[PDB]
């Protein structure tokens, strides 16, 4: 009966759908799934879902993967009010939008640079990538630049998304100095419900990284 | 005052949103904009948004991009009942979460073959890459052997946009011999208003790739 999310701190979306748990204040059930241990992972989870999906939100038996529709399904069954997912089309478009930016174009080129690095052997940035995800990043220094947040003057679940990918990069390691919206959203994010949560998950990602890259 | 969609017929998510705007039946006028030839580009584009983003929507000056932000905010504020994008929370959570595949995995994958190979010298398709596209079709031929289509046993936006993706692939050429649920959802999808308009489409882009594989 207890709503559960199936949770790797070290993973941007996982940590995406838990502040988006924490910006709408659901009381939640988390269970810990160590990916780097898959001999250890546990019962209760390879039951459930096709394959090794985190986040996985059980709510009630609704089992349900993907960060961001994980994010959006909870602001709209549990949210208090309108704030964090703005029930205006257009207003709700924008945030869509922005979610679809995290997910096709941000944590997309934020993973082009960390897999490879973690897992497949790779010791260095290659500077296509790193060209890449600035393109990227350039853009969202301009979503900043006519707004506080990401997709409105107020805190959306596009601020909880994008700022678990953002602080991913930046413990790796990223120079943001020619982005200065970036720089002063990121404060910003701080203040989010979560946020140190977010910061220790997403530290061990940036540990787990550099450890790996030859300098 | 009229619904307009700024679209170039060779991009899968183009396509994807075109598809949307033919489900849901809502006239739209569309304006072709060719991204093969940038010093071509018209001014009426140009103005509008931040950078060359395609598609791009223009409902009544309320400006959109990313195709699947385009598809739902099109079902919900034109759709002339449910079927397409269900309002029903956990039926909606579904579709969005295969929106969110579509994004995050499909066309990701797709273009990490493809964008090198338009554009960047590369001649043939990574075997490494093909793995990881292959991984994540299989993914989606699971999705398929569930329901009909995939998001529900009735067909959704969730279709029409992995629909754009997969004729993408196929158009290039690829062997899905090993996913028979992808290869039954592929020929209703031919079903789907404006399926020959993307068709043609996804075949201008298949043959912009194979032109640059040395066989």
């Not at 780097?36 to 394959?51: A, I, V």
Request: aromatic content about 10%.
């Amino acid at each position: 009966s207890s709503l559960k999310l199936y949770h790797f701190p070290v993973s941007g979306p996982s940590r995406g759908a838990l502040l988006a748990a924490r910006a709408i204040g659901i009381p939640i059930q988390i269970e810990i799934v160590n990916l780097f241990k898959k001999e250890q992972l546990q019962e209760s989870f390879l039951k459930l879902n096709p394959q090794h999906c985190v986040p996985t939100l059980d709510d009630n038996n609704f089992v349900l993967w993907e960060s961001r529709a994980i994010a959006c399904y909870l602001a709209d069954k549990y949210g208090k009010d309108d704030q964090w997912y703005p029930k205006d089309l257009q207003k709700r478009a924008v945030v869509n939008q922005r979610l679809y930016f995290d997910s096709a174009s941000l944590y997309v080129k934020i993973r082009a640079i960390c897999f490879p690095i973690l897992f497949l052997g790779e010791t260095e940035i290659k500077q296509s990538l790193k060209d890449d995800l600035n393109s990227t990043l350039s853009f969202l220094n301009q979503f900043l630049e006519k707004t506080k947040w990401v997709a409105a003057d107020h805190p959306t679940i596009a601020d909880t998304s994008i700022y678990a990918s953002m602080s991913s990069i930046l413990a790796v390691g990223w120079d943001i100095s020619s982005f200065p919206n970036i720089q002063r959203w990121i404060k910003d994010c701080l203040l989010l419900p979560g946020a140190p949560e977010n910061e220790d998950g997403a530290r061990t990602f940036g540990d787990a990284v550099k450890k790996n890259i030859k300098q």
